[PDB]
Scaffold this active site. Structure first.
Site, PDB file in Angstrom:
ATOM      1  N   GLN A 135      -3.814 -21.621 -40.094  1.00 21.64           N
ATOM      2  CA  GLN A 135      -3.942 -20.309 -40.461  1.00 21.64           C
ATOM      3  C   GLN A 135      -2.764 -19.505 -39.967  1.00 21.64           C
ATOM      4  OE1 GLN A 135      -8.007 -19.005 -39.060  1.00 21.64           O
ATOM      5  NE2 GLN A 135      -6.748 -17.299 -38.873  1.00 21.64           N
ATOM      6  N   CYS A 173      -8.820 -16.220 -41.486  1.00 20.52           N
ATOM      7  CA  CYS A 173      -9.908 -17.473 -41.717  1.00 20.52           C
ATOM      8  C   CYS A 173     -10.878 -17.071 -42.882  1.00 20.52           C
ATOM      9  CB  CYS A 173     -10.687 -17.050 -40.346  1.00 20.52           C
ATOM     10  SG  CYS A 173     -11.521 -15.490 -40.469  1.00 20.52           S
ATOM     11  N   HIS A 184     -15.534 -15.025 -36.796  1.00 23.08           N
ATOM     12  CA  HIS A 184     -14.620 -16.080 -37.428  1.00 23.08           C
ATOM     13  C   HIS A 184     -15.251 -16.974 -38.445  1.00 23.08           C
ATOM     14  CE1 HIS A 184     -11.571 -19.161 -37.421  1.00 23.08           C
ATOM     15  NE2 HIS A 184     -12.148 -19.987 -36.909  1.00 23.08           N
ATOM     16  N   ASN A 233     -12.373 -26.458 -39.104  1.00 24.55           N
ATOM     17  CA  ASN A 233     -11.708 -25.244 -38.621  1.00 24.55           C
ATOM     18  C   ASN A 233     -10.110 -25.117 -39.281  1.00 24.55           C
ATOM     19  OD1 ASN A 233     -11.464 -22.594 -37.229  1.00 24.55           O
ATOM     20  ND2 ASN A 233     -11.450 -23.539 -35.403  1.00 24.55           N
TER      21      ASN A 233
HETATM   22  C1  LIG Z   1     -10.812 -14.444 -38.907  1.00 22.21           C
HETATM   23  C2  LIG Z   1      -9.423 -14.674 -38.032  1.00 22.21           C
HETATM   24  O1  LIG Z   1      -8.696 -15.320 -38.870  1.00 22.21           O
HETATM   25  N1  LIG Z   1      -9.818 -15.016 -36.778  1.00 22.21           N
HETATM   26  C3  LIG Z   1      -9.039 -16.235 -35.893  1.00 22.21           C
HETATM   27  C4  LIG Z   1      -8.126 -15.638 -35.117  1.00 22.21           C
HETATM   28  C5  LIG Z   1      -7.248 -16.759 -34.409  1.00 22.21           C
HETATM   29  C6  LIG Z   1      -7.742 -16.945 -33.131  1.00 22.21           C
HETATM   30  C7  LIG Z   1      -7.173 -17.972 -32.341  1.00 22.21           C
HETATM   31  C8  LIG Z   1      -6.111 -19.055 -32.975  1.00 22.21           C
HETATM   32  C9  LIG Z   1      -5.615 -18.561 -34.308  1.00 22.21           C
HETATM   33  N2  LIG Z   1      -6.350 -17.286 -35.176  1.00 22.21           N
HETATM   34  C10 LIG Z   1     -11.213 -13.237 -39.193  1.00 22.21           C
HETATM   35  O2  LIG Z   1     -11.003 -12.368 -37.891  1.00 22.21           O
HETATM   36  C11 LIG Z   1     -12.310 -12.473 -39.910  1.00 22.21           C
HETATM   37  O3  LIG Z   1     -11.887 -12.239 -41.125  1.00 22.21           O
HETATM   38  N3  LIG Z   1     -13.185 -12.239 -39.142  1.00 22.21           N
HETATM   39  C12 LIG Z   1     -14.471 -11.804 -39.944  1.00 22.21           C
HETATM   40  C13 LIG Z   1     -15.557 -12.900 -39.817  1.00 22.21           C
HETATM   41  C14 LIG Z   1     -16.727 -12.222 -40.629  1.00 22.21           C
HETATM   42  C15 LIG Z   1     -17.906 -12.014 -39.769  1.00 22.21           C
HETATM   43  C16 LIG Z   1     -19.393 -11.487 -40.359  1.00 22.21           C
HETATM   44  C17 LIG Z   1     -19.262 -11.351 -41.693  1.00 22.21           C
HETATM   45  C18 LIG Z   1     -18.168 -11.687 -42.705  1.00 22.21           C
HETATM   46  C19 LIG Z   1     -17.150 -12.126 -41.831  1.00 22.21           C
HETATM   47  C20 LIG Z   1     -14.804 -10.542 -38.975  1.00 22.21           C
HETATM   48  O4  LIG Z   1     -15.067 -10.401 -37.931  1.00 22.21           O
HETATM   49  N4  LIG Z   1     -15.168  -9.397 -39.712  1.00 22.21           N
HETATM   50  C21 LIG Z   1     -14.907  -9.097 -41.382  1.00 22.21           C
HETATM   51  C22 LIG Z   1     -15.497  -8.201 -39.204  1.00 22.21           C
END
Ligand SMILES: *[C@@H](C(=O)NCCc1ccccn1)C(=O)C(=O)N[C@@H](Cc1ccccc1)C(=O)N(C)C
Length: 212
Positions: A19, A25, A159, A175
């Site tokens: 990604q 994610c 995530h 992942n």
């Molecule tokens: C996921 C994101 O892509 N995180 C990875 C970051 C990273 C770290 C190290 C190396 C490369 N990349 C993204 O934050 C995300 O969309 N998180 C969501 C997950 C979620 C949680 C609960 C319900 C639905 C979805 C998130 O935290 N939120 C939407 C608040």
């Protein structure tokens, strides 16, 4: 349902993607489930567009994060293009679904797995790859190199990933951090500990698409 399930062995999982620095994610997680269900239903393994979800799901926040449910609802209502037709760029641009022709695949809906229940998640995994969330913020998760991950981690989910299998003491997760992370891009997370939230909050919010 079987003692061991691995959707990679059944030809339902595409190669591991990266990604990058974009917080996409959610789109990646959603796509793994679409790739899986289309294989189970039609017999064909195709790659779908994470970029389309990133650009088009306005309920989500692009590279700032988003929701697998919302991305899965969008594919159910409109559809999705092939990954080669709409490749990953790692940056949110405008929705180009229209200019790229008709959609490649479309689903019929989305269902949620009964939260905080290991059995319910394993049942869903035995049927198809499922979008799951977990806490990835901890350095222990980030620096995972191999073996069965038991933590340490809390349940502050942040995530979105995808469950593509399981075994007696683990749930196999795909992942989106490249093939160099963990077990060739995968992580086996401990199951059966009695923690209702699941290891790293694994049982918090799990979705899967419905087809037919
Ligand atoms: C996921 C994101 O892509 N995180 C990875 C970051 C990273 C770290 C190290 C190396 C490369 N990349 C993204 O934050 C995300 O969309 N998180 C969501 C997950 C979620 C949680 C609960 C319900 C639905 C979805 C998130 O935290 N939120 C939407 C608040």
């Amino acid at each position: 349902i079987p003692e061991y399930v691995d959707w990679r062995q059944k030809g339902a999982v595409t190669p591991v993607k990266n990604q990058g620095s974009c917080g996409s994610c959610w789109a990646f997680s959603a796509v793994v489930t679409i790739e899986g269900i289309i294989k189970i239903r039609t017999g064909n393994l195709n790659q779908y567009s994470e970029q389309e979800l990133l650009d088009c799901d306005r309920r989500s926040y692009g590279c700032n994060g988003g929701y697998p449910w919302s991305a899965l609802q969008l594919v159910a209502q409109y559809g999705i293009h092939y990954r080669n037709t709409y490749p990953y760029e790692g940056v949110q641009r405008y929705c180009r679904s229209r200019e790229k022709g008709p959609y490649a695949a479309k689903t019929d809906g989305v269902r949620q797995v009964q939260p905080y229940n290991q059995g319910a998640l394993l049942y869903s995994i035995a049927n198809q790859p499922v979008s799951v969330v977990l806490q990835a913020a901890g350095k222990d998760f980030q620096l995972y190199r191999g073996g069965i991950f038991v933590g340490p981690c809390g349940n502050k989910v942040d995530h979105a990933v995808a469950a593509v299998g399981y075994g007696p003491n683990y749930i196999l997760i795909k992942n989106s951090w490249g093939t160099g992370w963990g077990e060739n891009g995968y992580i086996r997370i401990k199951r059966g500990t009695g923690n209702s939230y699941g290891v790293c909050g694994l049982y918090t919010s799990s979705f899967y698409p419905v087809k037919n």
